[model samples]
Each structure stands twice: as C-alpha cells, then as structure tokens.
Target: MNIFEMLRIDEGLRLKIYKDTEGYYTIGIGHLLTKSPSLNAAKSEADKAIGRNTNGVITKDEAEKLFNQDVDAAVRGILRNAKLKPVYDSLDAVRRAALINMVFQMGETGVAGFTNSLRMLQQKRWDEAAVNLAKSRWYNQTPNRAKRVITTFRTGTWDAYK
Candidate 1:
C-alpha cells in the first residue's frame, strides 16, 4: 500500500473531527487538535472545530498541514532518540524518508527491532537492508507499506503517492 493509504488505514480517516477515546479532539489523518508542534496550528485546529465552517471537521488541505507537521515531529523523534542518529542521518533522502515513514508506522523503539536492517542501513547495504526489513513482523502486518519503504530504500525514489 502507498504511505498515504497506509496512514489512512492505520490512523483511520475521520473527515470530520471527533474526540479520540483518549479525550483529545482528533481530525483528519490522526492529527491531534491539541498540543500540535506549532501552538498556532493547534489553536487553528481548535478554532476550526469550534467555528461554523468545517465546524465538526476540517478541510483536506487543512488536515494535510497538520499531518505534515506531525510527520516532522515523528522524524525529529527518531533524531532525538539518539541511538540511531548517525546511522539514520547517513542515508540518502529517499532512504531516510523511508525509515522515517517506518517510524511513523512503528514507533522508534519498534523500528529498533529491525536489528539486521539497521546494520545493513549503517553499512549502506540498501538492498540487504530492504530485505532484512521484510523479515520483521511489521512487514508481514503491513506488506504494502513495507514494500514501498523497502523499495524506497532499494530504488531511492519516493513511493507513498508518487
């Protein structure tokens, strides 16, 4: 599956915002209405939820902005974890984005389970890393997304939507 489709399936697309079971107003593709990376983004989401326009929901464009920011934070979360910094940073853009997307699917610690994959990544063994990625439970659970990530590493091209 493409990353876009995967995220929709993973997060459960809710066109109109609603409170998650956890009690936070969530909208779009799992974008949290509170505690956004940008204070303004958070406020804007809240405003929309309260405002009459897309009142109970948000526009796709609006939701996408929040998703991008959330993805940015997730990528930074990997960077902040420190254990994988040098290794993750050494990858090319496509490879790096694939790993970051992996992080999105599975938290940083979850991604760490791919020990062999990480080793191959550090060694710049792209094909080997991709193969090792397929060996994980995550791959079996989300094969389509995994294929895109694996192929991203192998071919150095973005495959989520393009």
Candidate 2:
C-alpha cells in the first residue's frame, strides 16, 4: 500500500494526496497524525504551519505541497537523466538510495552542489564521500538526520533516524 493508504487517510481527514516517485499526504499544520479537524482548510494554513516549523522559510501547507513536487522532480531527474547516471552508478544500491533521500530532503541544487562529495564519489572514495556528506550545510542544519544518512552511506548499513 502507498504511504497515504498506510496512513488510513480519507476525505474526512482533510488530507491532500500528492503523487510522484512516491505518494505522500499534504496535511495541515498540527495534523501530525490523522485526527486534525482543520486538515481540509485552504492550503495557506498548511503553508503557515510549515513556514513556522522551518523558521518561517515556508508555511506548513506550502512545505507539504512543495516537498512533494520537488522530491518527485529530483527522483525523476536522477532516474531518467543520463547525466546523473555516473553518480548513481558509482554508489551501491543502499548508498544510491540514501543519496536520493538526501536529494529529496535538500532539493537538487543542495544535492548537486556537493562538490567535494561528488569528487570523492568520482574517485571511488566512499569513506571521503561519506565524510564530505557530513560536512555540508545541510548536515550542519539537520544534524541528527544528516548523521543517520551519512552513517548509512559510509557503513552500508541502514539505521532509522530518531
């Protein structure tokens, strides 16, 4: 089942389903779970909630919508574009998946701008690539999440964040 289906969402939940490489629900602010009454309001409320969570960079609703759109695009670019194949080809399945996750979380420029990491990957330097991954601004911004993913990339092991 898809993520939305797993969430057991229905029209009453006021959730909007967005589809891409994966499916996710755009829930309103404070709708962390399925029980919020305001879930069906205009997207602005969700945007505001997202903005507040992200330090006002975007609203809660905007985050929900934008995240789905952006992540889908990044995955599509990686999967369909030949130019991205070299990077994808160099990493193992797990590492490649982790990279895709990072790209989804950080957006294309954020993932693509990792000059040092890209260089290390090109050289087949897994250890250094992992180290570089940990040194990004994205890493500094989201320490726990970044560390978890970096560890996976480095050790080829999967560990849940949080």
Candidate 3:
C-alpha cells in the first residue's frame, strides 16, 4: 500500500475546513491550517487555491495537491530528525510507513519525544515499541488509529492495510 494512501485513510479527506479533535482548524487530509511552523502558509495557500470564493472550501484537485504536499512535509520532518534518521533507515518498508504515519499524525517533535520507544524500534524490539506506544496519551486520543499503528509497529506487516 502507498504511504500517502494509508495516511489518507487514517486522516479522512475533507475539502471544507473543520476543527480537529484538539479544536484546531484543519483541512484537506488533516492539514493543520492554523498551527505553528507555518501557520499562515497553509491557510493562505488553501484560500488562494479555492479562489477565496468558497471561503473555507477547497476543490478535490486542490485537496489532493495539498495532501501530497503535507505528506512530503511529514516525510521531510521525519527524516530531518537526527535521532530518527538512523532508526528510519534501519526499518523495512512496512515499518517505515508506520513511522511516517506517526510523524504525519503527530509532529516530528512529538514522535521524537518517544525516546525509549524509538530506542526499542532501533533495536528491532517491535513488541516493546508497541507497548510503549500503547502507553501514550496519543493512544487514548485516537484508539482506532493507534490500534492500527501500534499493530503495524508490533508485526512489521501491512495487515492493517488489508
């Protein structure tokens, strides 16, 4: 399965701007439109793409473009983290997708904060990494997605995709 498609499933596409679980403005496959790191960028670009006529709405074509850009940004953010780079390179495709999924949901800093869990991943301790992930507040926030991600980490398989 493609990583971007996997994230699309997890994120659920929405052309119209909506508040996420944490009450932040989000759009187009969970793009954070009002967050730091580039708060104004997404909002402005999305508005421009929609021609400002639709206000908070984006077209499917524009949404797909934004989704792709967001995925690219997430990947860059993951690989740019010094501590994550080595661990990421050591993983197989399935496992790497799991890591990217994590970075897509949470920011790179959030995933980097996994410290001990990441250490477990580095050591190929799949079960331990899953356990550590299960113990997070993230697990509580979105148990369904967390279940799939944690299972992916545990099994190193794309069973969740099936």
Candidate 4:
C-alpha cells in the first residue's frame, strides 16, 4: 500500500473521540485535539473540520480529510526542518515514507533528536539506522510500529506488519 494507506493502518481510525496511548484527546485517524491548548478551542476546530457539531463523532470523509491535513503538516514540518531536510531528500520513496510516518508520530523536532540515526540514514547505512532506531525509547514504547518503520528504513519495502 501507499504511504497514506500505510499511515491510516498504523495510526488507527476512530469516528469518535478516544484517548491516544499518550492519553491525549485524539480523534479521526490520530488527529490531536489536545494540541489546541484549550479544550474548547480544540472541540470547536474539530466541529469546523467535520462541517457540523456531531457531538463527538466524525464521518469517513471528514476523517480522511483530517488525515490528509495531518500528513501534509508532517511532510511540511520535515521539509522545513534544517536537520531533517537533507536526510529526507536523500532517501528513496519507501524510506521517505518511513521518515514521514516517524515525523507524523512525533513532531519533526522529536525526529531531529535522532542525530546519529539521521546521520546513518544520510550515509545510506540502513542497518546502522535501524540499530539506532531500535535503541530509542520510541521503540520500547511502541515496539510494533517502530519495528515496522525500522524495517521499512532498512529494507526499503513496505512489508505488511498488521
């Protein structure tokens, strides 16, 4: 599957509000409503995205739209990140998707924290990159997702892990 489909599966979709693993108020393909600073503002924005106040639920279309917006934001964030842009530019499509997915899960700043991994990736040392990723707290916390991403980075293939 493509990056969008891969992310949709990885992130998990929900029509109603649910707490993410980190306990944030998330909804609709992992959209972080908690990012707004005020719960009221977050709720209002969610309603605006869905085009109506449907209580806590969203439509498939609305979810997809939000998902697209989130992905676009992640991509833009990565592109603008000085430390990540060149590394991102040097990767192939599949490996790039892995990085984008990583930045989507954690912000670009978080991904940029992986200095050694980014260096390995830039040097095309896939195995070293995977090793560095595996040693992170990220891998310990979300082992399966992190493993899949590491595999994609190492193998340059989107092998189904779900």
> What is candidate 4's lDDT per residue for 1-162, written digit by digit as tens?
778988988889999877787777788998887754455766777787678986778888889999999899999998999999999999999899999999989888899999999999999999988999999999999998899999999999887454
lDDT of each model, Cα atoms only? 0.70, 0.54, 0.84, 0.87
lDDT (tens digit, per residue) of candidate 1 on 94-155: 66777777787567898877777788888888788778888877778767767867888887
Off by over 4 Å in 4: 35-42, 48-51
Q: Decide which is better by TM-score, 2 or 3.
A: 3
For each candidate, what TM-score against the reference?
A: 0.66, 0.55, 0.89, 0.91
Give the Cα RMSD of candidate 1.
6.5
Higher-ranked by lDDT: 3 or 4:
4
Candidate 2's residue-wise lDDT over 1-162, tens digit each? 222221122111233422212122344221332223343432444455455433223444553564455445667877664545578777776667676666655556667777678778767787888887877677786676677677767766554422
Clashing pairs in 1: 1-144
Rank all candidate structures by their lDDT, best first, as comma-separated numbers: 4, 3, 1, 2
- Candidate 3 lDDT by residue in tens digits, 1-162: 879878988989898877787777788888777754353655675676556755677888888888888788888887888988988998998999999999988989899999999999999998888998899999999999999998988998779878
Candidate 2 segments exceeding 4 Å error = 1-72, 80-83, 160-162
Report RMSD for candidate 4.
2.0
- Which scores greater on TM-score, model 1 or model 2? 1
| Model 1 stretches with alpha carbons more than 4 Å out | 1-14, 17-27, 30-56, 159-161
